[PDB]
């Protein structure tokens, strides 16, 4: 029994907000914090029996990010001080719920069904605008462990992934997180 | 095709949270941060085909704000230091999604269909209480640009507004934001 | 008229976020902020006529908390500086909407219908994992005042509770909030 995805969508929370860098303008003043909203608009369905969102490893998912750039950024304020801004990246990856320090790579498919690692994508964020970034045809590179039901009940050792969607500033060969959300837990099934 | 508004309502995020002032009590101690929840409870309907909330410029909308005042505020901590608190204002305005520095004025109508600019309203926030503030009969002063469909598809240049709902402290002829939320994108149609 | 609880659930916001302590690791470095999600998954139903969630005092409710511990915590950074960490507690309590400084005790029932005060529960938070904590068979110790309808309309003096769900660190005989959410307003009826 699956809930209507027009009404039931993955919920997100800020991820590692105390570690984010911040953007500064040409006058060396911190900009008002950019607006940031993430939506996983394809590929996930809430399973009532599992009490969790489910996706199928081979059916692609899609994430849309709305990034509202307030002001005109010129610098990133890092732990090592201000640095000139080179570019922005959007980065997506999974983490294991039971081992949050272990990442699950994300792959992107093409029509010919070839798949490539999904590396961070360059995003241009013009000033005073929301930029909408849609990342489609995505797949987790692994299934979650212990998916099989036991006694018509969820596996007691059911494992999960959480999806991390992060906006990064690149400065002097280093990337710095500006904003990041992490999803609620997700089950990834093979068949 | 429109989603049920009892289940699908405008989502909000904190707006410019790094620029907010904070409230202090009579003993010069920062209060626990007030609770703040915004609900656009009339006038918006999610259009599946447009993948966005829609409203009609001439049908009024309504916003309800729940402000939970913890403690008894006496001062606002501004960038220029502590200042005695005079009053609180609730301020509502739109911004253009493609030009976030451009505001859309909000107007308020009466039964006789006259309309007036909606300026910030004085709100009394007694200590240790949630104050519910309902602002009704509202209208955007403009339609969004490029509303007309092209080939039975959304206009590729469809423009949007976002609604900003902010609680301000007034001190020494100056207003300071204490809490503010901004909505997801909204289409505003004429007919 | 009640909304489907598979689609309409209690919304939460961070509570007193400027007063939280933070966790540090063995190398005296602040950990990335833990992930924290609260769900009131049984006992609450949104009443359209009251424009609020309702529960029955004698039907128990249940809250599930997902706590994602990033890194390995060893110290709590308090206002009085770093202190070694002893244990973690999950604390739940109500507050009166019209008197936020007044708490509503929560009680927990057993099958034999005996009820005990629900005091904070010890939670073990192993590193690099989400710990799921489910707290069931709960009851508010009071009904909300002024529940009875007047003229087929909500009582104009209808009172409400808000639920607070807080993760605390215990250090040197003192508890420190690490993360806390507060619910939207709730009506608690007797019959």
Swiss-Prot record, chains A, B, C:
User: Motif Nuclear localization signal: where?
Assistant: 150-153
Consequence of mutating residue 137 to A? Decreased affinity for DNA
Q: What is this protein called?
A: Myelin regulatory factor, N-terminal
Q: What stretch of the parent protein is included here?
A: 342 to 532 of 1151
Q: Result of mutating residue 113 to A?
A: Decreased affinity for DNA
Stated role: Transcription factor that specifically activates expression of myelin genes such as MBP, MOG, MAG, DUSP15 and PLP1 during oligodendrocyte (OL) maturation, thereby playing a central role in oligodendrocyte maturation and CNS myelination. Specifically recognizes and binds DNA sequence 5'-CTGGYAC-3' in the regulatory regions of myelin-specific genes and directly activates their expression.
Disulfide bonds listed in the record: none
Residues annotated to bind DNA: 1-191
């Amino acid at each position: 029994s699956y809930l209507d995805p027009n009404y039931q969508s993955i919920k997100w929370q800020p991820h590692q907000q105390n570690k984010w860098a911040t953007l500064y303008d040409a006058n060396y003043k911190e900009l008002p914090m950019l607006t940031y909203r993430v939506d996983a608009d394809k590929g996930f369905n809430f399973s009532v029996g599992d009490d969790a969102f489910v996706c199928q490893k081979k059916n692609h998912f899609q994430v849309t990010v709305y990034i509202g750039m307030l002001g005109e950024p010129k610098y990133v304020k890092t732990p090592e001080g201000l640095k000139p801004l080179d570019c922005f990246y959007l980065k997506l990856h999974g983490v294991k719920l039971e081992a949050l320090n272990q990442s699950i790579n994300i792959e992107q498919s093409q029509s010919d069904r070839s798949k490539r690692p999904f590396n961070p994508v360059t995003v241009n964020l013009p000033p005073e605008q929301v930029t909408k970034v849609t990342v489609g045809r995505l797949h987790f590179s692994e299934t979650t462990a212990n998916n099989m039901r036991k006694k018509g009940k969820p596996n007691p050792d059911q494992r999960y992934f959480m999806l991390v969607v992060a906006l990064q500033a690149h400065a002097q060969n280093q990337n710095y997180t500006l904003a990041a959300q992490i999803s609620e837990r997700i089950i990834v099934r093979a068949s």
